[PDB]
PDB file of C-alpha atoms and ligand atoms in Angstrom:
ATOM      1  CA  UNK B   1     -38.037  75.520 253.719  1.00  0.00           C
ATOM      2  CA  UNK B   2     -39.681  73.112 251.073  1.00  0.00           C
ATOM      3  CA  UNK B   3     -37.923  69.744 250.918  1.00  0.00           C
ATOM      4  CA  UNK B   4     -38.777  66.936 248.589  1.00  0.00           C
ATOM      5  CA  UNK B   5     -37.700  63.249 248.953  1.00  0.00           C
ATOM      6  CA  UNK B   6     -37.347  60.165 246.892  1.00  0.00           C
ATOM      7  CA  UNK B   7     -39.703  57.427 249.668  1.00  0.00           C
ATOM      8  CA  UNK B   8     -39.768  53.728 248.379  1.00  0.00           C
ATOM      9  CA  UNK B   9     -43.541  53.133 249.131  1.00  0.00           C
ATOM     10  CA  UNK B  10     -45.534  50.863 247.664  1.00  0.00           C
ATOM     11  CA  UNK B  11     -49.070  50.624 248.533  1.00  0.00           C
ATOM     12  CA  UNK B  12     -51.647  52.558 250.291  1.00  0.00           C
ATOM     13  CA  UNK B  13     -50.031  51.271 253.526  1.00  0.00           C
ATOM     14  CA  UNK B  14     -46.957  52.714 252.875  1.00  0.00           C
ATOM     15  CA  UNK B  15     -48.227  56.106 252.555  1.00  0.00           C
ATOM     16  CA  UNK B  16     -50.049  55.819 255.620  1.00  0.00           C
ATOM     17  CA  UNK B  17     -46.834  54.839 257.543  1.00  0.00           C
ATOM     18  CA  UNK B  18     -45.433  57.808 256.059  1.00  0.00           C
ATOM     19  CA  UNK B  19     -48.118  60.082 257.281  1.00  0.00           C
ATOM     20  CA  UNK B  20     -48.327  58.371 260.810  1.00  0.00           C
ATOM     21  CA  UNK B  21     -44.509  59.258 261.225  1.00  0.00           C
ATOM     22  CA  UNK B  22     -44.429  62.696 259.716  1.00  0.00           C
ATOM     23  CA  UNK B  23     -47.981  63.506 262.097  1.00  0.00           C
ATOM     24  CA  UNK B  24     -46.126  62.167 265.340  1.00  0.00           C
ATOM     25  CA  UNK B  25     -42.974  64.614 264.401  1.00  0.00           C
ATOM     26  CA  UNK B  26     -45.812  67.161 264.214  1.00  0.00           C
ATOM     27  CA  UNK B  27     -44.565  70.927 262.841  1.00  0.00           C
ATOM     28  CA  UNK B  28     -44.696  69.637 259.311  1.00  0.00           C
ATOM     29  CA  UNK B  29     -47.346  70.601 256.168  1.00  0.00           C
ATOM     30  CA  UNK B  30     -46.588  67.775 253.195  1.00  0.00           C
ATOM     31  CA  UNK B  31     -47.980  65.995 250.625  1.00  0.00           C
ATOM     32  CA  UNK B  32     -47.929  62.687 249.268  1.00  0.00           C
ATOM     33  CA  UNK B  33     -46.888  61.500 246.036  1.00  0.00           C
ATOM     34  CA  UNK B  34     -47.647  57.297 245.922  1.00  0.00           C
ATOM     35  CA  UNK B  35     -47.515  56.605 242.242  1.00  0.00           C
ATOM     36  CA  UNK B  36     -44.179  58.377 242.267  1.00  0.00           C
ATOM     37  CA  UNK B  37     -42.460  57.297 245.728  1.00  0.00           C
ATOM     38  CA  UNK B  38     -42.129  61.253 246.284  1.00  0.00           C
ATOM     39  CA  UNK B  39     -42.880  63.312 249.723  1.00  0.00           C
ATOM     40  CA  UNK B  40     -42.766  66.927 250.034  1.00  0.00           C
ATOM     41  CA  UNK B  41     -42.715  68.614 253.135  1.00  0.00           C
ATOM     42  CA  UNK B  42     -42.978  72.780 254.292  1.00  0.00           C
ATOM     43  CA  UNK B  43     -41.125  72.554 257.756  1.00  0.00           C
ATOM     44  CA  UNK B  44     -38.817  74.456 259.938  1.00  0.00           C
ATOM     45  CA  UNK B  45     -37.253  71.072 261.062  1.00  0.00           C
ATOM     46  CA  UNK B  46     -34.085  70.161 260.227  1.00  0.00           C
ATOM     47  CA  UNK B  47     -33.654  68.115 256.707  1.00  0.00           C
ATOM     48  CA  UNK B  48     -31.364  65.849 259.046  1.00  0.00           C
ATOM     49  CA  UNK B  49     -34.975  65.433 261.187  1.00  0.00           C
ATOM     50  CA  UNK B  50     -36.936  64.773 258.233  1.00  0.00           C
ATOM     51  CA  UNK B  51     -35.038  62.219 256.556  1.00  0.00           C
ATOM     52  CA  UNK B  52     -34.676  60.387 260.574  1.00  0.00           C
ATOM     53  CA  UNK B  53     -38.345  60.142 260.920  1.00  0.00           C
ATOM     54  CA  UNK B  54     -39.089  59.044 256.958  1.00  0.00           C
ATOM     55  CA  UNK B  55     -36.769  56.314 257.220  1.00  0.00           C
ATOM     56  CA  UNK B  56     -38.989  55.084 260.663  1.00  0.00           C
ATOM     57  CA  UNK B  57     -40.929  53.550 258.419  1.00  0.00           C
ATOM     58  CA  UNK B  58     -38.127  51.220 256.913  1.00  0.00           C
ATOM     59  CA  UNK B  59     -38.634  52.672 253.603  1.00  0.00           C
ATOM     60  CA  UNK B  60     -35.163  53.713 251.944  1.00  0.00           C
ATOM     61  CA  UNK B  61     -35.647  57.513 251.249  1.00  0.00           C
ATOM     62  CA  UNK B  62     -33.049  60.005 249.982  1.00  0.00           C
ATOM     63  CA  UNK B  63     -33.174  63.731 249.424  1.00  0.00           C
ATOM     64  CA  UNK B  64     -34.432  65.132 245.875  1.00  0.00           C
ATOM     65  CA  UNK B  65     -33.520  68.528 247.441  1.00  0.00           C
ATOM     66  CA  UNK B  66     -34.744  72.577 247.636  1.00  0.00           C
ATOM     67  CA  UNK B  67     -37.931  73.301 246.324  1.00  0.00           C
TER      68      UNK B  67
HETATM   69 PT1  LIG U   1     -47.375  49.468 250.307  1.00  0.00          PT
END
């Protein structure tokens, strides 16, 4: 499935801490929208998984849904 989430990043950093988290979970194809504090991600994992390891980074994140 395709799942898209609401991440409260900020800077550059920020999307690099999400990428670190999502590339240690591993099984995951996504992209990174900064300027509009969105991540979508093309995964068999769980969405329970997903959200887990996006809020590692301390960022509050919630689920935009099905794409
Ligand atoms: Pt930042």
């Amino acid at each position: 499935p395709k799942h898209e989430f609401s991440v409260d990043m900020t800077c550059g950093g920020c999307a690099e801490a999400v990428s670190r988290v999502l590339n240690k979970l591993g099984g995951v194809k996504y992209d990174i929208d900064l300027p509009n504090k969105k991540v979508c991600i093309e995964s068999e994992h769980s969405m329970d998984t997903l959200l887990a390891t996006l809020k590692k980074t301390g960022k509050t994140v919630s689920y935009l849904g099905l794409e």
